[PDB]
């Protein structure tokens, strides 16, 4: 029973590590989210229509 309690403490440590990872992911996102979105929308708006290369006339 005591060792099960200790392993539960280690489980709480695992959960803390998971929360830390989630917060780190959120911060690293927040940092570059604006540039990511701007570039993605720029390349969405940039169309460049063009026929299939194998088309010949």
Q: What distances in angstroms separate CA 36 from CA 27, 28, 40, 44, 57, one per listed residue?
A: 14, 12, 6, 12, 40
Give the start-end residues of each E strand in the chain: none
d(CA 15, CA 6): 14
Q: How far is the CB of 21 from other proteins (least distance, A)?
A: 5
Site for other proteins contains 17 (CB under 8 A): yes
Q: How far is the CB of 36 from other proteins (least distance, A)?
A: 5
Residues that bind other proteins (CB under 8 A): 3-4, 7, 10-11, 14-15, 17-18, 21-22, 25-26, 28-29, 32-33, 35-37, 40-41, 43-45, 47-52, 54-55, 57
């Amino acid at each position: 029973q005591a060792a099960m309690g200790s392993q539960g403490n280690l489980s709480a440590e695992v959960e803390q590590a998971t929360r830390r990872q989630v917060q780190g992911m959120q911060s690293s996102q927040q940092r570059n989210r604006e540039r990511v979105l701007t570039q993605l929308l720029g390349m969405v708006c940039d169309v460049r229509p063009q026929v299939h290369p194998n088309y010949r006339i």
